[PDB]
Design a protein around this motif. Sequence first.
Motif, PDB file in Angstrom:
ATOM      1  N   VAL A  88       2.778  10.619  -0.482  1.00 48.95           N
ATOM      2  CA  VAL A  88       1.672  11.581  -0.313  1.00 48.95           C
ATOM      3  C   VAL A  88       0.363  10.783  -0.365  1.00 48.95           C
ATOM      4  O   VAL A  88       0.192   9.905  -1.198  1.00 48.95           O
ATOM      5  CB  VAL A  88       1.672  12.660  -1.393  1.00 48.95           C
ATOM      6  CG1 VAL A  88       0.714  13.780  -1.030  1.00 48.95           C
ATOM      7  CG2 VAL A  88       3.082  13.229  -1.545  1.00 48.95           C
TER       8      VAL A  88
ATOM      9  N   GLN B 190     -10.527  12.380   1.852  1.00 45.70           N
ATOM     10  CA  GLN B 190     -11.675  13.183   1.451  1.00 45.70           C
ATOM     11  C   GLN B 190     -12.617  13.390   2.641  1.00 45.70           C
ATOM     12  O   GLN B 190     -12.712  12.526   3.504  1.00 45.70           O
ATOM     13  CB  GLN B 190     -12.381  12.580   0.257  1.00 45.70           C
ATOM     14  CG  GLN B 190     -12.982  11.202   0.426  1.00 45.70           C
ATOM     15  CD  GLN B 190     -13.685  10.732  -0.849  1.00 45.70           C
ATOM     16  OE1 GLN B 190     -13.652  11.410  -1.878  1.00 45.70           O
ATOM     17  NE2 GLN B 190     -14.381   9.613  -0.763  1.00 45.70           N
TER      18      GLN B 190
ATOM     19  N   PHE C 106     -12.121   4.049  -5.229  1.00 44.24           N
ATOM     20  CA  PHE C 106     -11.715   4.563  -3.920  1.00 44.24           C
ATOM     21  C   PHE C 106     -12.890   5.176  -3.194  1.00 44.24           C
ATOM     22  O   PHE C 106     -13.120   4.941  -1.986  1.00 44.24           O
ATOM     23  CB  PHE C 106     -10.654   5.607  -4.076  1.00 44.24           C
ATOM     24  CG  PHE C 106     -10.348   6.337  -2.791  1.00 44.24           C
ATOM     25  CD1 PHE C 106      -9.682   5.711  -1.748  1.00 44.24           C
ATOM     26  CD2 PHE C 106     -10.832   7.601  -2.585  1.00 44.24           C
ATOM     27  CE1 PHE C 106      -9.436   6.373  -0.543  1.00 44.24           C
ATOM     28  CE2 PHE C 106     -10.597   8.268  -1.390  1.00 44.24           C
ATOM     29  CZ  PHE C 106      -9.889   7.650  -0.388  1.00 44.24           C
ATOM     30  N   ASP C 107     -13.631   6.007  -3.912  1.00 50.16           N
ATOM     31  CA  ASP C 107     -14.750   6.693  -3.247  1.00 50.16           C
ATOM     32  C   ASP C 107     -15.753   5.684  -2.661  1.00 50.16           C
ATOM     33  O   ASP C 107     -16.280   5.862  -1.555  1.00 50.16           O
ATOM     34  CB  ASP C 107     -15.410   7.621  -4.245  1.00 50.16           C
ATOM     35  CG  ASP C 107     -16.601   8.343  -3.688  1.00 50.16           C
ATOM     36  OD1 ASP C 107     -16.408   9.139  -2.746  1.00 50.16           O
ATOM     37  OD2 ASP C 107     -17.727   8.217  -4.267  1.00 50.16           O
TER      38      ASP C 107
ATOM     39  N   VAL D 166     -12.815  13.205  -3.913  1.00 53.39           N
ATOM     40  CA  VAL D 166     -11.795  12.734  -4.872  1.00 53.39           C
ATOM     41  C   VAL D 166     -12.360  12.530  -6.295  1.00 53.39           C
ATOM     42  O   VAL D 166     -11.602  12.564  -7.298  1.00 53.39           O
ATOM     43  CB  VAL D 166     -11.094  11.448  -4.333  1.00 53.39           C
ATOM     44  CG1 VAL D 166     -10.262  10.728  -5.379  1.00 53.39           C
ATOM     45  CG2 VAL D 166     -10.190  11.811  -3.169  1.00 53.39           C
TER      46      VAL D 166
ATOM     47  N   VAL E 155      -9.732   6.559   5.705  1.00 53.77           N
ATOM     48  CA  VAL E 155      -9.197   5.834   4.537  1.00 53.77           C
ATOM     49  C   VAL E 155      -8.393   6.841   3.706  1.00 53.77           C
ATOM     50  O   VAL E 155      -8.820   7.967   3.493  1.00 53.77           O
ATOM     51  CB  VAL E 155     -10.301   5.212   3.686  1.00 53.77           C
ATOM     52  CG1 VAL E 155      -9.714   4.247   2.673  1.00 53.77           C
ATOM     53  CG2 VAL E 155     -11.281   4.466   4.589  1.00 53.77           C
ATOM     54  N   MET E 156      -7.213   6.426   3.269  1.00 54.48           N
ATOM     55  CA  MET E 156      -6.349   7.331   2.510  1.00 54.48           C
ATOM     56  C   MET E 156      -5.891   6.606   1.243  1.00 54.48           C
ATOM     57  O   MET E 156      -5.712   5.394   1.251  1.00 54.48           O
ATOM     58  CB  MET E 156      -5.195   7.814   3.429  1.00 54.48           C
ATOM     59  CG  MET E 156      -5.651   8.357   4.803  1.00 54.48           C
ATOM     60  SD  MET E 156      -5.699   7.151   6.157  1.00 54.48           S
ATOM     61  CE  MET E 156      -3.939   6.950   6.461  1.00 54.48           C
ATOM     62  N   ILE E 157      -5.738   7.350   0.128  1.00 59.42           N
ATOM     63  CA  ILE E 157      -5.366   6.741  -1.138  1.00 59.42           C
ATOM     64  C   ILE E 157      -3.940   7.174  -1.458  1.00 59.42           C
ATOM     65  O   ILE E 157      -3.583   8.322  -1.179  1.00 59.42           O
ATOM     66  CB  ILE E 157      -6.317   7.133  -2.283  1.00 59.42           C
ATOM     67  CG1 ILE E 157      -6.249   6.104  -3.396  1.00 59.42           C
ATOM     68  CG2 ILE E 157      -5.970   8.468  -2.899  1.00 59.42           C
ATOM     69  CD1 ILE E 157      -7.191   6.349  -4.528  1.00 59.42           C
ATOM     70  N   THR E 158      -3.194   6.236  -1.996  1.00 58.47           N
ATOM     71  CA  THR E 158      -1.833   6.462  -2.540  1.00 58.47           C
ATOM     72  C   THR E 158      -1.848   6.014  -4.000  1.00 58.47           C
ATOM     73  O   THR E 158      -2.538   5.071  -4.351  1.00 58.47           O
ATOM     74  CB  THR E 158      -0.857   5.653  -1.724  1.00 58.47           C
ATOM     75  OG1 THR E 158      -0.825   6.222  -0.400  1.00 58.47           O
ATOM     76  CG2 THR E 158       0.551   5.668  -2.336  1.00 58.47           C
ATOM     77  N   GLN E 159      -1.127   6.746  -4.853  1.00 58.32           N
ATOM     78  CA  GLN E 159      -1.011   6.369  -6.257  1.00 58.32           C
ATOM     79  C   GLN E 159       0.430   5.956  -6.574  1.00 58.32           C
ATOM     80  O   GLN E 159       1.362   6.473  -5.972  1.00 58.32           O
ATOM     81  CB  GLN E 159      -1.507   7.471  -7.167  1.00 58.32           C
ATOM     82  CG  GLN E 159      -0.780   8.797  -7.116  1.00 58.32           C
ATOM     83  CD  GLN E 159      -1.371   9.803  -8.106  1.00 58.32           C
ATOM     84  OE1 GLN E 159      -2.373   9.525  -8.770  1.00 58.32           O
ATOM     85  NE2 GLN E 159      -0.714  10.938  -8.259  1.00 58.32           N
TER      86      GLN E 159
ATOM     87  N   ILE F 142      -4.094  11.021   0.058  1.00 60.80           N
ATOM     88  CA  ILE F 142      -5.218  11.941   0.009  1.00 60.80           C
ATOM     89  C   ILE F 142      -6.320  11.374   0.896  1.00 60.80           C
ATOM     90  O   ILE F 142      -6.503  10.153   0.923  1.00 60.80           O
ATOM     91  CB  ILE F 142      -5.741  12.160  -1.423  1.00 60.80           C
ATOM     92  CG1 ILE F 142      -6.495  13.473  -1.511  1.00 60.80           C
ATOM     93  CG2 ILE F 142      -6.694  11.076  -1.868  1.00 60.80           C
ATOM     94  CD1 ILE F 142      -6.982  13.820  -2.880  1.00 60.80           C
TER      95      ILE F 142
ATOM     96  N   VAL G   4      -4.848   8.409  -9.602  1.00 62.33           N
ATOM     97  CA  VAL G   4      -6.086   8.971  -9.025  1.00 62.33           C
ATOM     98  C   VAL G   4      -6.925   9.756 -10.058  1.00 62.33           C
ATOM     99  O   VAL G   4      -8.160   9.920  -9.891  1.00 62.33           O
ATOM    100  CB  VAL G   4      -5.759   9.831  -7.765  1.00 62.33           C
ATOM    101  CG1 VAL G   4      -6.922  10.688  -7.297  1.00 62.33           C
ATOM    102  CG2 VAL G   4      -5.344   8.922  -6.622  1.00 62.33           C
TER     103      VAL G   4
ATOM    104  N   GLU H 151     -14.229   4.029   0.366  1.00 66.82           N
ATOM    105  CA  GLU H 151     -14.066   4.999   1.436  1.00 66.82           C
ATOM    106  C   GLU H 151     -15.375   5.321   2.118  1.00 66.82           C
ATOM    107  O   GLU H 151     -15.398   5.379   3.345  1.00 66.82           O
ATOM    108  CB  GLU H 151     -13.415   6.287   0.946  1.00 66.82           C
ATOM    109  CG  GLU H 151     -12.988   7.244   2.068  1.00 66.82           C
ATOM    110  CD  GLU H 151     -14.089   8.158   2.554  1.00 66.82           C
ATOM    111  OE1 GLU H 151     -15.019   8.478   1.772  1.00 66.82           O
ATOM    112  OE2 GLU H 151     -13.963   8.662   3.692  1.00 66.82           O
TER     113      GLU H 151
ATOM    114  N   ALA I  70     -10.665   6.628  -9.053  1.00 65.97           N
ATOM    115  CA  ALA I  70     -11.219   7.594  -8.131  1.00 65.97           C
ATOM    116  C   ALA I  70     -12.584   7.081  -7.661  1.00 65.97           C
ATOM    117  O   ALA I  70     -12.893   7.158  -6.454  1.00 65.97           O
ATOM    118  CB  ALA I  70     -11.309   8.963  -8.766  1.00 65.97           C
TER     119      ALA I  70
END
Lengths: 270, 270
Positions: free
Chosen positions: B34, B38, A20-21, B11, A34-38, B36, A11, A24, A17
């Motif tokens: 975990v 936004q 994702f943005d 993010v 919407v959720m992000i995992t790394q 994230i 991320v 999202e 990033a």
Amino acid sequence: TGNIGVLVSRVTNPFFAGLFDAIERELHAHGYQVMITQTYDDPEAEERFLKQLKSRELDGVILASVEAPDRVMAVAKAFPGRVVVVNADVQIPGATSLVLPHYQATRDALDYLFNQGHRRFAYVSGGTISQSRTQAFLDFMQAHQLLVAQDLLFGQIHTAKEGQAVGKQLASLAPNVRPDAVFTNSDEVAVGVIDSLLAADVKVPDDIAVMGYDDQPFAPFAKIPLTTVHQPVASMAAAATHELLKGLGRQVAQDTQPTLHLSLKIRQSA
Amino acid sequence: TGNIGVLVSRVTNPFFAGLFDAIERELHAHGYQVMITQTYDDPEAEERFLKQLKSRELDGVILASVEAPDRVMAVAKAFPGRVVVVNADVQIPGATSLVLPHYQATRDALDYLFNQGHRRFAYVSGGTISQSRTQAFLDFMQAHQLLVAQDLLFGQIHTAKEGQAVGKQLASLAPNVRPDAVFTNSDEVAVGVIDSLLAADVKVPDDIAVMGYDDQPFAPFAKIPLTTVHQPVASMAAAATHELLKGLGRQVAQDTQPTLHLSLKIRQSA
Ligand SMILES: [Cl-]
Ligand SMILES: [Cl-]
Ligand code: NA
Ligand code: NA
């Protein structure tokens, strides 16, 4: 309209990033959370993420990094329409997969450098060099009958701090073994490399030219504004989002496709 | 050891991305997955995120931004031990809440600037100026009997692109109404401001000094390396992670507490 997961390697890589943005903001407008995992490229993290789809905690997923294509394939087959893959350098059967032309972009960026008169090349990668971009580099060197110097190959380099170490090592070299140009594969790495070169009074680009990759938000603002390969973050995010929405039955098919283009952005660092 | 959610405003703000990364790497080592989310400071996004705890899709949450403290409070009361709040400028009853000393840091950074001889100040904020930091600014100006110039207050400024607009406007000003110093509240905004000043041949810091905030990864690498307020990302992430783990019954209480300190980092831009 429920939950969507996005999988990325890191991320703190501003390309991920941004990607994702962009995904999202568009999905959010369609009513999704919407959720992000790394993963940090750990295949167990990828597996664990995919269990959230298999257990229907998520309605769909977008993967921007893939570790185990055949595992992704099995999930996509069980959950048709729900797995999209974007800019991961791989086509996954069962999953709509968008591949950008990184081989061409890399060859083009290298041709550029060769045309500026550069002949001794350092090549940096996030992978272990023993991979569209690496093959592009090897093809390039072969085409110009340039001998690959193993001392100027740097693998597992991802961050600006790691780029600083690379630059400090390059700045240490006698002018006759120093590379003419550095292909960094990352704007993060490029900022670090350049910072170390300048700290040692190595001129950029006149002594060593440094090519970035991605055209990250910081790129035009860098101490030596980055020459780089521009990834079309907004366009690829829109394409991936549309493919997932279509698969989920939210959106109608469209005629007009993006052709997603990588483009060489010339600034100051090369 | 299940799923944990982390809530941030944006993010693509490298401070939030770093904070998430530090929390995630530590939780991942403890066996948690975990993710994230936004908000872009939308209270409905916060509400929706909290429903994932209420429905037990998540075992716990860490909030780094808060919109509606009383809603967070109600969830924390229903789910004791499962809601932690970090660096959100607010203490939430029912939730372990870690507040850093932003009022002091802001007063200290402003004192620094005043001590360099600066007397006309621009103040930039992500909020609408009509807020520990804003009160610190107003207190500062009052203490030195300096008249607040409304023309040099800029609200709702979050990004480098927005900072570019601010800098272009400041660079446009006659030398006698131009600020001596700009308190940006963000390293992103500072990079943009500085880039526009330099494009107009306004010297930084000799014509206009620019103070950042956060000490983001790009800060030391900026064209004019940023003078800024350093947020202790690793330490605060560790503290928030420990408070959540303790609340979930995974970790034992410890005697040794962090005192989380903000510190002024002096480089070149001010
Ligand atoms: Cl690709
Ligand atoms: Cl705080
Ligand atoms: Na040269
Ligand atoms: Na001055």
